[PDB]
């Protein structure tokens, strides 16, 4: 009542479990400006603080997708919907840059120490 929050449900929501309410300021968007007193979910919240989208898709065999991904992964900015080419179709559908990880037996080039 005193705090204009959903009098009976916004409380129950943040009180006992993790549904967050942006307290003072939060510059970055959801699509709209920082919600002064509005509340959000873990999921969307997660999408915020670490970075927009997380996509870890790791290849099946050692030579088919490990090559498609590697060639375009290290310095190349991978655009949304980057259609990696081998098992099925490795679909990278989101933003900016890419970081691959290990490499077995095929050909070794441009990798870390």
């Amino acid at each position: 009542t005193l705090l204009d929050l959903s009098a009976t449900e916004l409380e129950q929501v943040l009180y006992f479990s993790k549904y967050i309410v942006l307290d003072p300021k939060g510059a970055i968007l959801n699509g709209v400006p920082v919600e002064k007193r509005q509340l959000l979910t873990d999921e969307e919240y997660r999408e915020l603080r670490y970075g927009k989208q997380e996509t870890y898709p790791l290849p099946p065999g050692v030579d088919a997708l490990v090559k498609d991904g590697e060639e375009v992964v290290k310095g190349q900015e991978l655009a949304p919907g980057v259609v990696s080419r081998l098992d099925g179709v490795a679909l990278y559908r989101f933003p900016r840059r890419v970081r691959v990880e290990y490499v077995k037996k095929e050909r070794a080039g441009l990798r870390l120490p």
Binding site: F16, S17, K18
Partner: protein
């Protein structure tokens, strides 16, 4: 709404989004955790700062702002200025030592990550130590504290993976918890196992007699130094208490605590007692010699219960002399004017 489901979903969901691969991810994280250690220590070496200090500053930068330092641990590390100063020297560490800084943080992160991923492990474990007297969430939580303990000692050099390792370090944390918190009136772990053995034994004894064992069997079957007094005693401690607030007689509206009387409190009879007793004892104490009467009055009625150590400078002979002569003149005139005879007790 209802609390088990939400947490279950809470971690199950995160594991569902990030389980750790059998070898790779656990190896990776492991490797990072260790390097963190080696890093922090080497940081301690070059900064002169305690590895405890180096540990908490990297924690703050990776796990939480001034908010997490201020509320959890009251206030000895200045929320802003203090930790920051520490991060500045870390920056100053050239190319060579700066590396350890960068590693330490990354290692600290990996740690938390390994901890997150192996939370299903705890709950699966904690799931079976259910009916011991601890709440499922309490159980998972202690077990959780156990998995964190394991994280501190696992040596990835020794090939075995964290699965089997966490198992032990968790089961130990749980069992302890069960033995330390489950009862209102604490009972050491030995008494606990003791009680389990006693129970189990009573079980095998119920097996054939058709007679709930007299405390004779239990002693025998138990072993070396078991006797009737011992078993009657253990099961007496085994009974948890009773709810002072329990429905009594016709449960209609009866509460067990209105019925217990009180002992320290002087029921009227006693207040009147101490009134006359003190007034009459005080009257006798005045019209007398303050040499051995007050000695035995104060030595007996003022501090604690020593003939020799009772009188100041004058030895025992004058003590016994006035003690027994004044104590009898006092008693024999009190025999005349009978005031004390009627034993106030």
């Amino acid at each position: 709404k209802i609390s088990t489901s939400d947490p279950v979903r809470q971690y199950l969901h995160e594991i569902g989004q990030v389980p750790l691969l059998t070898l790779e991810e656990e190896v990776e994280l492991a490797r990072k955790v260790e390097e963190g250690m080696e890093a922090i220590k080497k940081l301690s070496e070059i900064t002169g700062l305690d590895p405890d200090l180096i540990r908490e500053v990297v924690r703050a930068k990776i796990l939480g702002s001034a908010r997490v330092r201020h509320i959890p641990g009251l206030k000895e590390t200045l929320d802003p200025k203090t930790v920051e100063e520490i991060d500045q020297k870390l920056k100053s560490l050239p190319k060579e030592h700066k590396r350890y800084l960068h590693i330490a943080r990354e290692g600290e992160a990996a740690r938390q990550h390994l901890i997150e991923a192996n939370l299903r492990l705890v709950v699966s474990i904690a799931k079976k130590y259910t009916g011991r007297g601890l709440s499922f969430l309490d159980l998972i939580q202690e077990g959780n504290q156990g998995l964190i303990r394991a994280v501190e000692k696992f040596e990835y050099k020794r090939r075995f993976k964290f699965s089997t390792y966490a198992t032990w370090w968790i089961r130990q944390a749980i069992n302890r918890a069960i033995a330390d918190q489950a009862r209102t009136i604490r009972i050491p772990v030995h008494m606990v196992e003791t009680i389990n053995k006693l129970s189990r034994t009573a079980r095998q004894l119920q097996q054939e007699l058709g007679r709930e064992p007299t405390y004779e069997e239990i002693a025998e079957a138990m072993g070396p130094g078991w006797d009737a007094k011992r078993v009657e005693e253990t099961l007496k401690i085994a009974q948890e208490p009773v709810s002072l607030e329990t429905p009594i007689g016709d449960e209609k509206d009866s509460f067990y605590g209105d019925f217990i009387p009180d002992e320290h409190l002087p029921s009227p009879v006693d207040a009147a007692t101490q009134s006359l007793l003190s007034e009459e004892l005080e009257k006798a104490l005045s019209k007398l010699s303050e040499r051995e009467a007050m000695v035995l009055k104060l030595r007996k009625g003022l501090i604690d219960g020593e003939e020799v150590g009772a009188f100041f400078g004058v030895t025992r002979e004058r003590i016994r002399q006035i003690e027994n002569k004044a104590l009898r003149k006092l008693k024999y005139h009190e025999s005349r004017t009978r005031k004390l005879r009627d034993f106030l007790d």
